């Protein structure tokens, strides 16, 4: 028997399936980009989803069902998530660097101005502003959800969490429409390049964040969370705030100042 509070995880096949799924997706992308075939990519995306599902399922089994998450294990998970979010911030930073580098010294090919000649930016006061109020609102509602959970109120936790998710979905739908309606494309020089790749990666994070919240929603439905132990929910909320903050920077930099 162990006399420390840490978790010794059972030998697992997920790390391997995750690694291989990484190989299938990258290989798949290469086959798609060059040998016009999505077969590998399809299998890769599939094993990847399967790996994530089973791995996080096991984490739920180990914590909610088996009780391996002592305060020390939970403390470690907190550091893990904070560190993960920091690396995501640095990833976005590279894209904001690319944006500012291009926009601050427009080359002659763009007409030596920003936005480039021939680019008609979206009005920041229209959908982009709506998108901003949607994310900020979801930031408030998820805080309501957290307080409800900690005060032991099941119904209101579910209500607030639902509202948060709906808002995330609303943002996603609005952004998808904005993408379709935009007179510029990803191929429209560095403007389109920075615009779509930055907002595109942000959009992907919104989808990941929403998914994470939805997972919390169902775990909440099944009574997994106690008024005091609910790290999965706390992490999703932190991640959600990150997504919300990245948007505010995108909005201020690309949509507003960059127009």
């Amino acid at each position: 028997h162990q006399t420390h509070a840490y978790h010794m995880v059972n030998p697992s096949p997920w790390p391997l399936t995750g690694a291989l799924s990484a190989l299938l997706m990258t290989s798949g992308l290469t086959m798609w980009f060059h040998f016009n075939s999505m077969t590998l990519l399809m299998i890769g995306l599939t094993t990847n989803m399967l790996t994530m599902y089973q791995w996080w399922r096991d984490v739920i089994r180990e914590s909610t069902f088996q009780g391996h998450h002592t305060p020390a294990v939970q403390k470690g998970l907190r550091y893990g998530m904070i560190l993960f979010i920091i690396s995501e911030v640095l990833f976005f930073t590279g894209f904001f660097w690319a944006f500012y580098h291009s926009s601050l010294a427009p080359t002659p090919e763009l007409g030596g101005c920003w936005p480039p000649t021939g680019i008609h930016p979206l009005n920041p006061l229209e959908v982009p502003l709506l998108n901003t109020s949607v994310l900020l609102a979801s930031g408030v509602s998820i805080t309501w959800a957290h307080h409800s959970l900690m005060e032991g109120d099941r119904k209101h936790m579910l209500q607030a969490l639902f509202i948060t998710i709906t808002l995330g979905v609303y943002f996603t739908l609005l952004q998808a429409s904005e993408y379709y309606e935009a007179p510029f494309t990803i191929s429209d020089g560095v403007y389109g390049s920075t615009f779509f790749v930055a907002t595109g990666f942000h959009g992907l994070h919104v989808i990941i964040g929403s998914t994470f919240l939805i997972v919390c929603f169902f775990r909440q439905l099944k009574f997994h969370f106690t008024s005091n132990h609910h790290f999965g929910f706390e992490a999703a909320a932190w991640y959600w705030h990150f997504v919300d903050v990245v948007w505010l920077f995108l909005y201020v930099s690309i949509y507003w100042w960059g127009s």
């Binding site: 090919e109 709506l130 408030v140 307080h147 109120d153 494309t185 020089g189």
Partner: protein, 84 residues
């Protein structure tokens, strides 16, 4: 800042719900009003075959290789101009 409201005697669940329905959602309602108002399809600009736009260094891995992923015929011209 401090906003222009007050509470702070104890920020709890009732307070955050008060904010969700009394400030946050109403703000989203107003912006939704404003947006679904200033919309209306704006007259697509004359096409000019600028060399820094409609970039094509390699065909796209989909369709005929010449259409962007979320191509909108109405507002997105091809390297050769708007579509039929």
């Amino acid at each position: 800042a401090s906003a222009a409201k007050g509470d702070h005697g104890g920020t709890g669940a009732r307070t955050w719900r008060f904010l969700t329905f009394g400030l946050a959602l109403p703000s989203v309602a107003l912006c939704t009003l404003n947006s679904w108002l200033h919309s209306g399809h704006r007259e697509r600009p004359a096409f000019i075959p600028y060399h820094h736009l409609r970039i094509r260094t390699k065909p796209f891995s989909w369709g005929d290789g010449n259409h962007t992923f979320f191509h909108n015929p109405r507002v997105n011209p091809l390297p050769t101009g708007y579509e039929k």
